[PDB]
Amino acid sequence: TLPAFLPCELKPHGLVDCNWLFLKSVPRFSAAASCSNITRLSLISNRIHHLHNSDFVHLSNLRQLNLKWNCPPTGLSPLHFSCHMTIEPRTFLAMRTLEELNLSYNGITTVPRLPSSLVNLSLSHTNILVLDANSLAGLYSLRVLFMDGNCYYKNPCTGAVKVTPGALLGLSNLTHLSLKYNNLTKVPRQLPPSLEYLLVSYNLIVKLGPEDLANLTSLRVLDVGGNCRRCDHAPNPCIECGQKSLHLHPETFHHLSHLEGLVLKDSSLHTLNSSWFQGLVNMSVLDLSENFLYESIQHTNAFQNLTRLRKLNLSFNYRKKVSFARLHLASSFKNLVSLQELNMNGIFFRSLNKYTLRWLADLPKLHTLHLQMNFINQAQLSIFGTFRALRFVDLSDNRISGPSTKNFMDRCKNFKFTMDLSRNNLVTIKPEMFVQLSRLQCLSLSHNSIAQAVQGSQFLPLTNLQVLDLSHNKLDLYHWKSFSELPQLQALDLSYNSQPFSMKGIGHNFSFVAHLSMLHSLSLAHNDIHTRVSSHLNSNSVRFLDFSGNGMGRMWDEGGLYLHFFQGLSGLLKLDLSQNNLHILRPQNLDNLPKSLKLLSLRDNYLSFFQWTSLSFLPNLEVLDLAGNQLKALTNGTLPNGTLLQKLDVSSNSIVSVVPAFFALAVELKEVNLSHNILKTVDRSWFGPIVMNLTVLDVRSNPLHCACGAAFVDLLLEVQTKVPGLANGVKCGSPGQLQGRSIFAQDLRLC
Amino acid sequence: TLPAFLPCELKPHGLVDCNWLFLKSVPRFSAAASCSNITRLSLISNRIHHLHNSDFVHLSNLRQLNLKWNCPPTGLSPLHFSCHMTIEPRTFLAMRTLEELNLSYNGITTVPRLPSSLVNLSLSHTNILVLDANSLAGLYSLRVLFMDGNCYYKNPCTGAVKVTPGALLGLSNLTHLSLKYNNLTKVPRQLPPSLEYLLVSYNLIVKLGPEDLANLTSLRVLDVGGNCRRCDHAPNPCIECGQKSLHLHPETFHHLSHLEGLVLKDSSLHTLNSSWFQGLVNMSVLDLSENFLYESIQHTNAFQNLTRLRKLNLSFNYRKKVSFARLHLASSFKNLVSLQELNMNGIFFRSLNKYTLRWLADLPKLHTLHLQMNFINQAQLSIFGTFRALRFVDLSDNRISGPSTLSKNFMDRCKNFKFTMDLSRNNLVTIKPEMFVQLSRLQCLSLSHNSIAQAVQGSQFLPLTNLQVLDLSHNKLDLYHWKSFSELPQLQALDLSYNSQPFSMKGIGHNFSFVAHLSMLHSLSLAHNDIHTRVSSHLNSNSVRFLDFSGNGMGRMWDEGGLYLHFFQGLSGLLKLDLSQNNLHILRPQNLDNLPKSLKLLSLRDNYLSFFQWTSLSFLPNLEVLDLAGNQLKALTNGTLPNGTLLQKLDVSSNSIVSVVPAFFALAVELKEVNLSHNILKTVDRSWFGPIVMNLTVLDVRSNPLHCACGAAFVDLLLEVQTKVPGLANGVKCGSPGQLQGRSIFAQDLRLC
DNA sequence: AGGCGTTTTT
DNA sequence: AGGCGTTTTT
DNA sequence: TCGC
């Protein structure tokens, strides 16, 4: 019965998870029959500061071992405690087929001895400051070596990490090397020619030429960015570059015939020399972000031959203290025929018209365009209508205000054509701002300042639009023709348009909902809807209504005025009534919800009583969420006979008891969440036979009484596969010595 | 020791408070030595459905008794349970000096017999449908009678309540009568001439003349509103009036020589007849709201003789489905020389011209003007500069967007001020200094809840040379230029809260260096701004005393190496700092040590702290108040309050505190209030405090799962400090053992054991 | 001695 | 039987 | 981190 790898948790393919258990030593698993099947062990963020020769002898088949964060270096310790990890010399040699080891975020100053089998090692965020030819001796199979972050502001050293010339040459299967944030002044010498990925960003390598990348002819990805930073844009401490620019020899990259990815971000480059990219037929991903290329991208020839480039990042190439009236991409962009994604965020230019992006408009595969954070105040959005293959254009966080002079957007991820105009300065919508954008399927105007009694004339051209996010505006819902000019509209988010609904004395009107014939998903959430609105919603199409964060409590206190508010939503399948200040809920109010309802959320209300037989008025209910209410027990009835309920969430209540056979008639029941309540026990007699059909039974954060004979232990073991965090997350509230500890910290059957 | 009016709570001036204890009967107070000094008893919202002759015999000196909500009528019951209250006949006669009784929200159908001494009775929201000459017999001293709400949508009846002719005549000291929401078709006949206040609103009295107010010449206040309602404005079920208008005889009120207050709201009036107000020299308060007087107020002579009118409500006199281009108040308004307050909310007119309120501009005592919810899109704000005594003008909830083209709430600081304007909830996107011409006298201005998206830089507020308070909360201000707000020489309180959107732009930074140039600034809020990255690393000031920084990301800022380590330090003199809801998962000593040494109040409410090193309080030498509520503390440990600490209040409520280390509080000589509520304490120990427990003014231990075992030690402590523990009598409850879960620590006696 | 705590990337 | 719960005014 |  006992899970067998206590205090850890056994998981799928040979993985034992011991993360976050505050262990001071490698667990012995004494009362397991065999540790021979254990091939992966995770000990993340425990407190193991001392490792011994005998610690892994019983785990001799491990292939994967994670020891991250056991002994954090000073700068990474939340309280800046120094930690020094000791490792006896033969500690890891007992695992003769170990393939992957993570020692990151540990206070070690030298590499311990490791087995020949090792393939992937991380020494990142440690205090190892020298790698010489003895550091990783004999690791002939090593393919991947991370040692990032051993000398920077969060894990400081006085000088720099040193990688001696030829130190890694003996690692002749090494393909991936990462040595970022180490204060290096040069690319280490005589690196293994087998390298395909070299990352040396955020060091102090202010000069590069071909000699620094000698014999590395197998490189596919090279990241040399952040070595001459522009600190005006840094979000973190930033080391001032000694020069105006990274010095890059013209022929630096010419011998890297296989190169596919190059990162030159944050290099303080004021010009592009096309010879950098010459002879790289497979250059696919280029990052030029956070440089000073604002003029260069309007003039350069450097893109002429980049005919296989797929992704290009030009973001935050802004001029200090300036925005530009206009920006015109250079004609050489016309050659980027393979280009799928371009990032032009944060260059800072005030008008967007046909000349800005002219040379992108005929590229046959440009799908994705980022134009955020540019202080754009005039935009001829019509230009996007003749682009060859646009799927997503993001103009969010600009200053567009009109024509030129649970996240709803997840629904749009594989759409034909989505535009994001959120976080702009729109106060009214004029249909002319949409000329030539008839192909749009999805549009966000969220987080604008739209304060308008919409009435059918705002969105005239958008005859293909299926999704519209208008959340976080100040829309006045009043005229019945609102949104009826959108013939294909299926999802409409009107959440966080609360301000008008808070006007005491001015009413509103939802009769428009009845005229939206394709509308399937509607949010009216967080609108402060509480008084002076229409008394009936009506639809034949709406299937999901989010009414979270309103005042239905107050509405259902107004005599019968709002008694049939949801009733005319024929076919409604899901209704969210969370956070509606409900202090009671009458049977008549549930009986007048649509009979089609499969999901009702009452999360985070103030219900301290619930009449369970009233679930018979929701014949089709499969999911009921009553979490965050004030239920004192599960009582005043039982789940009623015939109920189709599949999930009941009654977490985060004040439940102290459950009545006999409470769950027993709910034949379809699969999930029950009882967590964060005040149960002293868990009883088979609450469920009867249906406990064996449950897929999840969550009983964490209950103050379970762990006295010696305790009965619940046998129940939880019988369904152990179905109770999340059983091994160490289900804890006792009493007696005193066991408060806050696992129900398995004592054995409560052996006594 | 035991409080001895258990389970109730004894309060000052003979009040015993038994509210909300779910009692099914009048408590006996057996344990009390004497119940003779009990003069007031409150039993609100208990479950007493049956009252007996013997219930009140020990409480024979009661002067006030409140029994409301004990037996709710069906319509008012939250679950629509029917309730019938039984009352034995001599029940209230045991209290021969009873002066005030509240029987409201109880299912009674008959008035019980009452003592002669009674002065104030409420029978509201009951099921009494008839008052006849026997209902209130012998109550010669009765001054006040409320019986509102016995026949309306929330407490329905079949017909209407009936007050039979002359039923109340024998109550010849009766001064206040209220009979609202009763479905009356007429004012009851032969009411007592002693009446000074008569309220008959929200019935169906569609017709009134002098005959209906016969012989009531002592009236000071008459409320006849809501008898012919306009249902287009109702927030609740509304009965359609049978007529276009309430029918009001011209001389209805003429004989009410002493009348001071008249309510004609929601009467469907399309005209005013001046004869209504004639002969009423002391008319002070007039409510004409929710009528159809949109034309009438631009033309009528009705205000000519209202020379003592102080308050006038014209609100929501709008035309159905219409807003007006313009509006001119009638010249008769010029005569309202006593007028202090005028409410013109919700008429719906789009321009506010210099002329619109021309006839108000010379009234010598007009202090307060309400112009909300009018769909005003053009406004000549300059006119308010010429008004003779304006103290507050409210233009909130309109559509103003700029200068005219025509020819914890910071504003609470402004309630005594000489001149405040509220422009909140308008459509401003940029501020132009010209919108402020002639408003140089303004001391307070709200622009909150607009859409202002502007890199303020010193030129926005030029005319406002006397402005002390500026509320800019809930906008989209771009804090960047150092000259922001430096044109406001007298600015003392600035609210920049809920301007978060710019701070959420990933890759564009901001700058707070402007704060250093605001030389009078005493109170600043940067709350709920998502301030977390790419901002200036130092705030500086010599004047700022209160900074609200709640709802930001200091957690993330203090995880960026040393970049923000001295963020608050240069606020010299800072006295209060709110760092609640800043996603703090840890605090180092250096973080507290680099707050200004002047600090008296620090809030860390609702963070994620599960450790706190108490010896770090020595680095806050002037601290008097510390709020750590809503964190994840598991105990009070890792130090004790240090010697010399000036701490007065410590709130550690709503944590997960299971233990307190010995003498944790002992050296805090100044300590007065400690909140330990909503934790997981099984006990409360004198040894946590030592002798300073006697100097505490509040020790809050509710919602802890106290172990109520037979000898339990905490009981003696709590009794020793009983006047200092809120809700001791019934609100401090046991978690265990099972028999006592959820019950008062005094439900058993835990010493006799 | 070793605590602290769920730790993106810059 | 009585339960429900903090209940402004409309 | 926002016209010269």
Next chain:
DNA sequence: TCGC
């Protein structure tokens, strides 16, 4: 509960 929001022009003609």
